[PDB]
């Protein structure tokens, strides 16, 4: 038995949003609901306990309430830092038996779009001595969190041996991603130049390296 | 600050054992709990041990859980027996508030004596009596089970799997010959399994301008991550892969 939350909600900057937490009379109806905020990378943060009490350092923008078997977390004056996964919780039948909600991911709309910063690293001399060459394309500080990566060598698109990560949230609510071109030492020295082309919101940022001068 | 320590990889059907210590205060005065989150799942309660030595567990997992504690060394342990791939999760050590409140009350329209008339003598001491405005009623008892997590540890990622461990190869990253005012360096942590890997710079003395990226997963099952630093001097990245007991301090020179 787990508590029912919406999988995702969204609000605009400066506005307010509500997250519901529906259970039975055994858990939520018991009258002692807690709320927790999970931001990727950081440790989980206790927001609310005892339905309405705020934990230490929790601003009044976070307000908990409950009507019977349904608890609600209300977040006012939404900011980009509020984007996180929110979980409700309650004891059931015992103070040592806690049940968690399904979890709600909060998206704050209206944030300014940000182009990606791109850094393209050549393979190192040590890796080249092992007859391998990895080109590392690091993409950071873009919003919204979706980019398309295209690799090119001497004007031709590279599809084989390309691996690109998902976009992952940064601390500033911006996103990061990386793309790896795994070549051999000979493939690296064969071409005249390699390019990592990152497209974001119709705009493309391109960084290039040339094996003749990366030595 | 709560610190979880234990193995990053454990084989199926083995016993996963973790320990928790606090930095800054004593765990002797607090009730210590364990919470985990499997990837792509919600938070899941495991159990706790309170100041009185009593242990309570998630009923669904009670037969596989054991939470003990040592009060001389100020340490709390967690044991999960016969682990399976479902037990892969990030495990958090917590301090929890646990309390059961009992409330005694007469039912609606009943009192402990006032305005009961003849019913006060007829109902007796043990029961409530009907108020003007059945003849008797017994006391009702409402229980409020208070639970919440006071403090959270940072969490320890534990992967359960029968696959082998591959140590990473750490390579220095730097721009090519041919400039920019702020030099950008990096470190490539190539072809390792399983997660996680930690990266610091100059033994933790360098934090401004550091950007460590999440890992990529190749089809071979091996992971690779990179960490870059922007500096407007010696630079060394400290890579640690606990699953293979590997620790590499790679010097990076432009």
* φ and ψ at residue B242, rounded to 5 degrees: -65, -30
Q: Which residue has the tokens 């364990």?
A: B34
Give me the helices (H) in B84-208, please.
119-123
Question: Mind giving me the DSSP string for B89-122?
Answer: EEEEEEEEEEEEEEEEEPPTTEESSTT-TTHHHH
Do residues A21 and A3 make contact, with C-beta atoms less than 8 angstroms apart?
yes
A205: tokens are: 């940022």
**Using CA atoms, how far apart are residues B72 and B5, in angstroms rounded to an integer?**
18
The answer, for A82 touching chain B at a CB cutoff of 8 Å, is no
B143: tokens are: 């229980």
Do residues B188 and B173 make contact, with C-beta atoms less than 8 angstroms apart?
yes
Q: From chain B, pick out residues whose CB is under 8 angstroms from the CB of A38.
A: 43
The answer, for A136 touching chain B at a CB cutoff of 8 Å, is yes
**Using CA atoms, how far apart are residues B251 and A140, in angstroms rounded to an integer?**
24
CB pairs under 8 A between A and B: 155
Total residues belonging to chain B: 254
- Provide Rg for chain A, Cα atoms: 24
Do residues B226 and A138 make contact, with C-beta atoms less than 8 angstroms apart?
yes
**Using CA atoms, how far apart are residues A49 and B148, in angstroms rounded to an integer?**
6
The C-alpha angle A35, A37, A38, rounded to 5 degrees, equals 140
Q: Reply yes or no on domain A1-110 having CATH 2.60.40.10.
A: yes
Which of A92, A35, A66, A89 lies closest to B145, judged by CA?
A92
Record: contact A36-B225, CB cut-off 8 A: no
Q: Which of B147, B151, B214 sits opposite A168 (nearest CB)?
A: B214
Q: Which of A44, A96, A168 sits opposite B92 (nearest CB)?
A: A44
Q: Which residue has the tokens 């007469």?
A: B106
Record: contact A97-B59, CB cut-off 8 A: yes
**Using CA atoms, how far apart are residues B228 and A121, in angstroms rounded to an integer?**
10
The answer, for A104 touching chain B at a CB cutoff of 8 Å, is no
Do A1-110 and A111-211 show the same overall fold? yes
Q: B16: part of which helix (H) or strand (E)?
A: strand B16-22
CA distances from B48 to A46, B33, B84 (A): 17, 4, 22
How do strand A62-67 and strand A53-54 relate by DSSP bridges? unpaired
The listed CATH number (3.40.5.10, 3.20.20.140, 2.60.40.10, 1.10.10.10) that belongs to domain B169-252:
2.60.40.10
Record: contact A36-B149, CB cut-off 8 A: yes
Class of the A111-211 domain?
Answer: mainly beta
**Using CA atoms, how far apart are residues A212 and A194, in angstroms rounded to an integer?**
11
**Count of CB atoms situated within 10 Å of the CB of A81:** 11
CA B147 to chain centre: 16
Q: Which residue has the tokens 């999960």?
A: B80
DSSP state of A44: P
Q: Which residue has the tokens 């931001």?
A: A39
Q: Which of residues 145-204 of A touch B (CB under 8 A)?
A: 163-165, 168, 176-180, 182
Do residues B118 and B25 make contact, with C-beta atoms less than 8 angstroms apart?
no
Residues 6+ apart with CB under 8 A from B130: B109, B110, B116, B119, B136, B137
Q: From chain B, pick out residues whose CB is under 8 angstroms from the CB of A168.
A: 213-214
Record: contact B42-A165, CB cut-off 8 A: no
Classify residue B13 as exposed, middle or buried by CB count within 10 Å of its CB (0-12, 13-18, 19+).
exposed
Q: From chain B, pick out residues whose CB is under 8 angstroms from the CB of A100.
A: 42-45
Resolution in A: 2.0
A209: tokens are: 């390296």
**Count of CB atoms situated within 10 Å of the CB of A157:** 11
Classify residue B234 as exposed, middle or buried by CB count within 10 Å of its CB (0-12, 13-18, 19+).
exposed
Q: Which residue has the tokens 């929790």?
A: A58
Which of A7, A4, A8, A15 lies closest to A107, judged by CA?
A8
**Using CA atoms, how far apart are residues A117 and B123, in angstroms rounded to an integer?**
80
The C-alpha angle A140, A142, A143, rounded to 5 degrees, equals 150
**Using CA atoms, how far apart are residues B98 and A70, in angstroms rounded to an integer?**
22
**Using CA atoms, how far apart are residues B90 and B157, in angstroms rounded to an integer?**
4
Q: Please, which experimental method was used?
A: X-ray
Query: Chain B closest CA to A126's CA: distance in Å?
Result: 7
Question: Could you check whether the bond before residue B196 is cis, i.e. omega within 30 degrees of 0?
Answer: yes
Do residues B8 and B89 make contact, with C-beta atoms less than 8 angstroms apart?
no
Do residues B190 and B246 make contact, with C-beta atoms less than 8 angstroms apart?
no
**Using CA atoms, how far apart are residues A77 and A55, in angstroms rounded to an integer?**
18
Q: Half-sphere exposure of A140 toward its Cβ, with a 13 Å CA cutoff? A: 19
Q: From chain A, pick out residues whose CB is under 8 angstroms from the CB of B146.
A: 32, 50, 91, 95
């Amino acid at each position: 038995a787990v508590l029912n939350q919406p999988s995702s909600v969204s609000g605009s900057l400066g506005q307010r949003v509500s997250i519901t937490c529906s259970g039975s009379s055994s858990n939520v109806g018991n009258g002692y609901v807690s709320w927790y905020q999970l931001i990727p990378g950081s440790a989980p943060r206790t927001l609310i306990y005892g339905d309405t009490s705020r934990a230490s350092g929790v601003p009044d923008r976070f307000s908990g309430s409950r009507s019977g078997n349904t608890a609600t977390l209300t977040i006012s004056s939404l900011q980009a830092e509020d984007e996180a996964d929110y979980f409700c919780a309650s004891a059931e039948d015992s103070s040592s038996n806690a049940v968690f909600g399904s979890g709600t991911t909060l998206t704050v709309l209206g944030q300014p779009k940000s182009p990606p910063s791109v850094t393209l690293f050549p393979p190192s001399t040590e890796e080249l001595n092992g007859n391998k060459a990895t080109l590392v394309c690091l993409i950071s500080d873009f919003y919204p969190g979706s980019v398309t990566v295209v690799w090119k060598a001497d004007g031709s698109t590279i599809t084989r041996n390309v691996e690109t990560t998902r976009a992952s949230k940064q601390s500033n609510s911006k996103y990061a991603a990386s793309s790896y071109l795994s070549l051999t030492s000979s493939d690296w020295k064969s071409k005249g130049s390699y390019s990592c082309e990152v497209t974001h919101e119709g705009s493309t940022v391109t960084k290039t390296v040339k094996p003749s001068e990366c030595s | 600050q709560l610190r979880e320590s234990g193995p990053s990889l454990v084989k199926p059907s083995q016993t996963l054992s973790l320990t928790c210590t606090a930095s800054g205060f004593s765990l002797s005065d607090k009730a210590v709990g364990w919470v985990r989150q499997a990837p792509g799942k919600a938070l899941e309660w495991l159990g706790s041990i309170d100041t009185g030595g009593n242990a309570g567990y998630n009923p669904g997992l009670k037969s596989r859980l054991s939470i003990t504690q040592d009060n001389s060394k100020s340490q709390v342990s967690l044991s999960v027996s016969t682990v399976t791939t479902e037990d892969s999760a990030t495990y958090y050590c917590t301090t929890v508030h646990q309390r059961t409140k009992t409330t005694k009350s007469c039912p609606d329209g009943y009192s402990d004596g006032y305005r009961c008339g003849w019913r006060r003598s007829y109902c007796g001491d043990r029961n409530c009596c009907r108020v003007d405005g059945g003849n008797c009623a017994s006391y009702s008892y409402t229980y409020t089970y208070e639970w919440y997590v006071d403090a959270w540890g940072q969490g320890l990622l534990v992967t359960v799997s029968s696959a082998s461990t591959t140590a990473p190869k750490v390579y220095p990253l730097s721009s090519c010959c041919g400039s920019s005012s702020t030099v950008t360096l990096g470190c490539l942590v190539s072809s390792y399994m399983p997660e996680p890997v930690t990266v610091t710079w100059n033994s933790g003395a360098l934090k401004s301008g550091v950007h460590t990226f999440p890992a990529v997963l190749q089809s071979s099952g091996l992971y690779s991550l990179s960490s870059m630093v922007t500096v407007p001097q010696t630079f060394t990245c400290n890579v640690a892969h606990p699953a293979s007991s590997t620790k590499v301090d790679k010097a990076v020179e432009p």
